[PDB]
Amino acid sequence: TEKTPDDVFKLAKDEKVEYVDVRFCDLPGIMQHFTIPASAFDKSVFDDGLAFDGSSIRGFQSIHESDMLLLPDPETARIDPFRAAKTLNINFFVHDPFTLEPYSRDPRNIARKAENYLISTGIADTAYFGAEAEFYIFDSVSFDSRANGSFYEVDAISGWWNTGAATEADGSPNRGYKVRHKGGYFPVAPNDQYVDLRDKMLTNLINSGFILEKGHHEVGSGGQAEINYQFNSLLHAADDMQLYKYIIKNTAWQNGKTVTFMPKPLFGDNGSGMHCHQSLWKDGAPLMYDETGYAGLSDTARHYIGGLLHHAPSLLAFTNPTVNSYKRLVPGYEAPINLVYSQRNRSACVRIPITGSNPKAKRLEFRSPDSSGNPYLAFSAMLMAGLDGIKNKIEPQAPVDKDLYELPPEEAASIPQTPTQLSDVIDRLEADHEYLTEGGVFTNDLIETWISFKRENEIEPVNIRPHPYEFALYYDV
Amino acid sequence: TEKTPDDVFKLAKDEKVEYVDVRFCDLPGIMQHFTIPASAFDKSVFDDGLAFDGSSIRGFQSIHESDMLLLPDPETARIDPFRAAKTLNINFFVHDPFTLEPYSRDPRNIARKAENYLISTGIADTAYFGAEAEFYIFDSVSFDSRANGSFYEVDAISGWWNTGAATEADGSPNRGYKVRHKGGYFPVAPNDQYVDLRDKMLTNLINSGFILEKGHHEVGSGGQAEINYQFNSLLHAADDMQLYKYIIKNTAWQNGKTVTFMPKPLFGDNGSGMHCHQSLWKDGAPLMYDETGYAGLSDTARHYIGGLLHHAPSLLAFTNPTVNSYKRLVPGYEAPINLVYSQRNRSACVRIPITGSNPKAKRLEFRSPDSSGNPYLAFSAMLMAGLDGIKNKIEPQAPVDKDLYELPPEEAASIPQTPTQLSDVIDRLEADHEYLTEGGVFTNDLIETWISFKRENEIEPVNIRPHPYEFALYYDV
Amino acid sequence: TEKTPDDVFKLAKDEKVEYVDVRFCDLPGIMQHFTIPASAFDKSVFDDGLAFDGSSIRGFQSIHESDMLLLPDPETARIDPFRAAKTLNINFFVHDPFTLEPYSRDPRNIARKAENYLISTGIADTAYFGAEAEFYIFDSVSFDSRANGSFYEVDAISGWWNTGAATEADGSPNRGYKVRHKGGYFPVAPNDQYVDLRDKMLTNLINSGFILEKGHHEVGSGGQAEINYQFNSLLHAADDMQLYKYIIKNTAWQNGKTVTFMPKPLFGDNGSGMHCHQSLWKDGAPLMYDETGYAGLSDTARHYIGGLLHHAPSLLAFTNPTVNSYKRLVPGYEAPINLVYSQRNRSACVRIPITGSNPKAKRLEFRSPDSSGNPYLAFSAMLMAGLDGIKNKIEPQAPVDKDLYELPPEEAASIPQTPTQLSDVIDRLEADHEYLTEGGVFTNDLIETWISFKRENEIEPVNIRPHPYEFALYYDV
Amino acid sequence: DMQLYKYIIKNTAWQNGKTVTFMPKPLFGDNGSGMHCHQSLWKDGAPLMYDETGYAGLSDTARHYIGGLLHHAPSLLAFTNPTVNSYKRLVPGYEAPINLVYSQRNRSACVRIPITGSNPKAKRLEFRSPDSSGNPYLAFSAMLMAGLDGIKNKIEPQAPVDKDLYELPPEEAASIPQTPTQLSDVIDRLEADHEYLTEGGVFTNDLIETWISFKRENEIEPVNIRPHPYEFALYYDV
Numbered sequence A, B, C: 001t002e003k004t005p006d007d008v009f010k011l012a013k014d015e016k017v018e019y020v021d022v023r024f025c026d027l028p029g030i031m032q033h034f035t036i037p038a039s040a041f042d043k044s045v046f047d048d049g050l051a052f053d054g055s056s057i058r059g060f061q062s063i064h065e066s067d068m069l070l071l072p073d074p075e076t077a078r079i080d081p082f083r084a085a086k087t088l089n090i091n092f093f094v095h096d097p098f099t100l101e102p103y104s105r106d107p108r109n110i111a112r113k114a115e116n117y118l119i120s121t122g123i124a125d126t127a128y129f130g131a132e133a134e135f136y137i138f139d140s141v142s143f144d145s146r147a148n149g150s151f152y153e154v155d156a157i158s159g160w161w162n163t164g165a166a167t168e169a170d171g172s173p174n175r176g177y178k179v180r181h182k183g184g185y186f187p188v189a190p191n192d193q194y195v196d197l198r199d200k201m202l203t204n205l206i207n208s209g210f211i212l213e214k215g216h217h218e219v220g221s222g223g224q225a226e227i228n229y230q231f232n233s234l235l236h237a238a239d240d241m242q243l244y245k246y247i248i249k250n251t252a253w254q255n256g257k258t259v260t261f262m263p264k265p266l267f268g269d270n271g272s273g274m275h276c277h278q279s280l281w282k283d284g285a286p287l288m289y290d291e292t293g294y295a296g297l298s299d300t301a302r303h304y305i306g307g308l309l310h311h312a313p314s315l316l317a318f319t320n321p322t323v324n325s326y327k328r329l330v331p332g333y334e335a336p337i338n339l340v341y342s343q344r345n346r347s348a349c350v351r352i353p354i355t356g357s358n359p360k361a362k363r364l365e366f367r368s369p370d371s372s373g374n375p376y377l378a379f380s381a382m383l384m385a386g387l388d389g390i391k392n393k394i395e396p397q398a399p400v401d402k403d404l405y406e407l408p409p410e411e412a413a414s415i416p417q418t419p420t421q422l423s424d425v426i427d428r429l430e431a432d433h434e435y436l437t438e439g440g441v442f443t444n445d446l447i448e449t450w451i452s453f454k455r456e457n458e459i460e461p462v463n464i465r466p467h468p469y470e471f472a473l474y475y476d477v
Numbered sequence D: 001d002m003q004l005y006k007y008i009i010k011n012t013a014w015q016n017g018k019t020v021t022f023m024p025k026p027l028f029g030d031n032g033s034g035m036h037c038h039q040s041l042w043k044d045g046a047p048l049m050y051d052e053t054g055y056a057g058l059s060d061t062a063r064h065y066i067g068g069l070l071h072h073a074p075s076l077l078a079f080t081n082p083t084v085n086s087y088k089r090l091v092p093g094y095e096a097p098i099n100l101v102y103s104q105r106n107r108s109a110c111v112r113i114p115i116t117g118s119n120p121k122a123k124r125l126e127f128r129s130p131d132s133s134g135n136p137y138l139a140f141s142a143m144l145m146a147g148l149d150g151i152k153n154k155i156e157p158q159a160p161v162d163k164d165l166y167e168l169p170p171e172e173a174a175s176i177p178q179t180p181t182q183l184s185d186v187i188d189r190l191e192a193d194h195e196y197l198t199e200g201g202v203f204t205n206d207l208i209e210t211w212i213s214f215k216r217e218n219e220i221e222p223v224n225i226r227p228h229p230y231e232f233a234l235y236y237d238v
């Protein structure tokens, strides 16, 4: 957006950087990389780019499309706080060597195309995304899948399921303060056993350019935590999310822990979601506010919500893209499965934060997403769903501020739910994805690849493997 | 059918029976019981019945319908070969104390109603069922489900996954012969390590009245086994299945093993199914044969097949009633998921055994079922599906004898598949179950109870619990 | 009371604070928190407040009342001595975002309302509270509750029950000095094994603004300890109590120990109580003294005592709010269960400290309370009970200075006792709580919530679980 | 016979490597163990509980007996459910016989009338609330005395309830009296009202006072002064 290639070279020189880490995003959502010496990092990298091979195998350029060209995004340049050798990390866009044409299956290109499409519609020129990803801090994790058995086990010294431990893992005495009490789930130390670690995470985020102001907090509940930061334009917000996960995971790693952003690592404890605040702006001014509308929402904002709610069944294929996503999105902890908007209900897919009369603070919050996938694709899909709602003036059903939990059974049957299985949302995406292909942001090719990837690599593998509970339930049949 | 109450009293006297075990079937399919002294077993038991309480809680008579009356079925009387104290086992029908009206939720009453309905339609007077249930013999099984972890583990000394064991569980040396070789899966000893156990099972079955003649074999492959026996009329065939499972499970138990009839206990090994051969007879003569028809099938037989194939999506709710059922019914080991009939294909839902010109041997084989449920309900549901096909002269799509595996992709898309999830078949049963309620054989009440039971006690519990493979797949997201 | 927002900003600047910990109290009594960077801590925090979500679930704003606004109390600002990253802790009041109306279920608001009500009655303008909370220092604690068993175990290297230990937990030799001798329970080292730890606690309290003067001591008996400090006005005294517990618990935690403020952690050893000294003042002058009255008590003071004794049965619902509270409040260690006032008896609910002729030192001491609950609610409830006694001129029964222990059985039957069970005091609170709702200090809403919380989360859970002693007593029945 | 039964059950298990318990609630999260007591009065070799015209085939004598059981239940339980553990079974849940009403359907009813038909010799009432944690001689005797007091004073039991007590309109369910939920309670009630027991000198005030003291000093107090494990889960962190 505003950082110049020269700013990056200055950063590299001042920091005495010795290596540059070339990063790009894979299909499912994990950042990939290779390293080059800082001496090889010059103007030609920004002008001509870097050559590399379609490596590994699914999503990207196979051996009929092999070679790729990588072009850097100066706004993503950050000094790595973990690598011993001073390193500068930069994210790249994948292009076709010959035509210099942005590769259609590169998640970062999709996000860029989404931003350009927004501008082309004239509706707005900027889509701001604020995402809040919760995560769990564990001490260990082990699992396997064999012919005659299977298991998984996550553990934490201070886990509430360990109150009866005679001694700790390391032989030291059990000092308590593990129990999860009724009344409040954000107790101070010593009940809060991750204060210093979270502070290290926060310190690393701040040193890595994250902006923490107004309602940006660092919070923890048991082993779960969340550190929210200032929003950003679509693409860069997605880059920020990847950076956040990287910083959270490695700060924990360097401090003897292991973090997971999976939706539901614990059965009988809160899942981890990614609440996404969105809003459209044009010429430096907000487009979501209107004193006369419900919850201070403009016609643009309401139509956007109409798109999100209407497209949710397919949108979730990018927004909650894993089998584990549906262990969180299930009746219980006031799961955002109710296809309605509200200001009160937290079990509503879309919630409008109470921000008052300030037009610049008005935004909508899509609560259903989680961080088990690709933020570039998720944010883009959310924008496309919202834009389709604006273009077709889709009206969302009447908002609900009455507590959805205690509602007369016949009146509660009028509240649509989100699909409860990944195979479902994948089927829905396959059946209805035209809003995604608008302006060429998503291609049928990418969408078909995503559908195949999920079915073959996730849905089928889990489905063919007997679940442990099936033995409790059926060994005796 | 032919045994008299006097025959039972003679059996009891001759065998010097000291206890009588009163058995009745619960909703899901497990036999329940209580014991009375032989001295209390007289004519009044057959005339007046025995009183008992709706005990335990789901399916049967709650505390608004509490007390039940049990009437004995003399044909089910058998001497228990396992109980130390000489005991006579007898199955009972649950009646309403006051009206002496057969309880509508007693599986054995449903099977009896199904047989009576058959007679009332005039179509036939007898429905013969031959069922072949495979099972696995293990040495141990353990599992659990906790907040931070879950596991399951089945094991057998001679399991092919144990070739590398330094020593056996009991410290003795590993003598090999565990490997599962290519070429033939029914090798003789010592590769076959369960010869004596299976013989004990067979001996117990024979001593318990099972008839083994013509094509009735005892077969074993690794830890898997099957002992087939002569068919019987619907109700008694279902009683025979319960007896078979009882004898197999306890023969193993008394010999230091543990048996499971669950559909898919091993990932990467054959599942366990229950192939059900069916045929209608009238006035002592077969109704399934016709030289002129395909595979020697009469119009009646073909229409029956039309009913099975047409109703399969809902029929499977009683025929493959567990979540584990769908780990077997999945693309692979030539799983009976293809909704077509054939003489060659074993992946076909219905197969017509090649029996020649003998009309008495002509029958159809529904291959899709497993023994993870209730045989009384499964057999009854199969009959009702077949009878609805006969009454509405439902024509099954053209049979397929070409190997279904290697079929041109466009021509293979014309082959309907069975649903791949329990939630699916339950949804289908809820939407279409009129063929079941014909003649009052099944009641909407029973069907709704079954649907609720499966959703609340099986589908939901498995669905909310993270699967071990999800950790392999998503811990790193 | 006297600290300015500017004083807080100066403290933050001088201490080079990097984080600000936002604290607020939950219903049962545990402080909650979330952290913001110091850079986000400015004048707008004091003027506009901070936004946050009704999080966790019971007591506070659900999803029909969701969002809350937090306003800081400058008098509670303290530098955290435990957090690695320099942090400033501040307590907040919960307000309604829209109306800026103090949330009726926020314990800190109740205490503030109580102080404002005092002023409105004209009776006095300040209520001073001096609280002395005892606690135990342990090395370990473990416990669990399962279907087939349950246990708990607290331990300390120097515990008197460990005299026979062959070697210590860490393998080191048993050096003795664990025995609890007759004659004196405050022996010097080495019998006193917590001298340095208690000094660290005291040092931390002093560095955190606690005032220790005249009769403020640091005392220890075995693993039990107490450090008393100077009183404060109601609200701030309650804030001081929370701070005290925080400092005691974390000083122990940082030094390899674990502290508990529970009423009765040890069976056969002294319980832990919270003696609360109270007194009313007006225009800078004491209102409790009168040379002519018994024990130097004024009419106002005597009526206050009348209120405490009259309302005790319900007052204890906030003053001794746990099931464990009644293991301390039981016939034995001269437990403050006798509903009378005195100067001699320590088993008297109210004791008047012998302070001489100095009017400024005259005060009453409610001995019955413990620190197992919420100090904001406890102190407020005590004030309301006392004020109701003053308004209705309630006369306490005649004081007793004769040793209550050795009293003629017929004359001892005239001494009322406090209820002996939490369910009892909760029932009494439900039946009589009008004195609490006076001036709107407590609302029926809050009181009903408290009653439900205790019944559902504490009373019922303990009541349904078999006690270990029941097995000693009844396994053999 | 009950004492013999317990002896035979306990020792058969003992000789076979097991250990048996008749305690009311040994397992948390599993069914408790009760002692359903069927009772009936006879005279000159003939039944006195039957009557075709009465509800559930009950005679005036039988109904009054039930009136005595339900009326005296609060104190009767001091001999019928005499232990602290007894109240872990007699608690809202597994359809615990805590509802002070009679019925033919409800198993959560203190008294249930078994459906036996028209045979007068089979008509009897079943007191479901008891357990075997005490003394059968005292329990059976106390039950008889409660029933006889009901017959002598023609105590009428409140209207029977055959509607499922579980799903009942909250305002209509508040009219159903419950049994006390604590041993200290039933002991207090026995102390306050035990005249029906002393009738004909069957029980003496002496025996009753001894029982009350025994329970308070040897059972109630000992359990009450000892912290429960769950209190640590609940309050160690206060």
Ligand SMILES: Nc1ncnc2c1ncn2[C@@H]1O[C@H](COP(=O)(O)O)[C@@H](O)[C@H]1O
Binding pocket: A128, A129, A130, A131, A132, A215, A216, A228, A229, A230, A231, A275, A277, A278, A279, A280, A353, A360, A361, A362, A363
């Ligand atoms: N247009 C916008 N204006 C202001 N904030 C926004 C906008 N679009 C997205 N946000 C994000 O809303 C998120 C926070 O939510 P909360 O859990 O309510 O504190 C932050 O991460 C914000 O920075």
Ligand SMILES: Nc1ncnc2c1ncn2[C@@H]1O[C@H](COP(=O)(O)O)[C@@H](O)[C@H]1O
Binding pocket: B128, B129, B130, B131, B132, B215, B216, B228, B229, B230, B231, B275, B277, B278, B279, B280, B353, B360, B361, B362, B363
């Ligand atoms: N009507 C019938 N006539 C002959 N056999 C039947 C009939 N109805 C069912 N069967 C059963 O067909 C089953 C065996 O199949 P297989 O695995 O091919 O040896 C046996 O269990 C038979 O006894």
Ligand SMILES: Nc1ncnc2c1ncn2[C@@H]1O[C@H](COP(=O)(O)O)[C@@H](O)[C@H]1O
Binding pocket: C128, C129, C130, C131, C132, C215, C216, C228, C229, C230, C231, C275, C277, C278, C279, C280, C353, C360, C361, C362, C363
């Ligand atoms: N009005 C008052 N004047 C003096 N001290 C007070 C007043 N109100 C409460 N106190 C508290 O009385 C407490 C101490 O008791 P002790 O265990 O006797 O040393 C201290 O914590 C005091 O500071």
Ligand SMILES: [Mn+2]
Binding pocket: A132, A275
């Ligand atoms: Mn949020």
Ligand SMILES: [Mn+2]
Binding pocket: B132, B275
């Ligand atoms: Mn077969």
Ligand SMILES: [Mn+2]
Binding pocket: C132, C275
């Ligand atoms: Mn004191």
Ligand SMILES: [Mn+2]
Binding pocket: D036
């Ligand atoms: Mn009974």
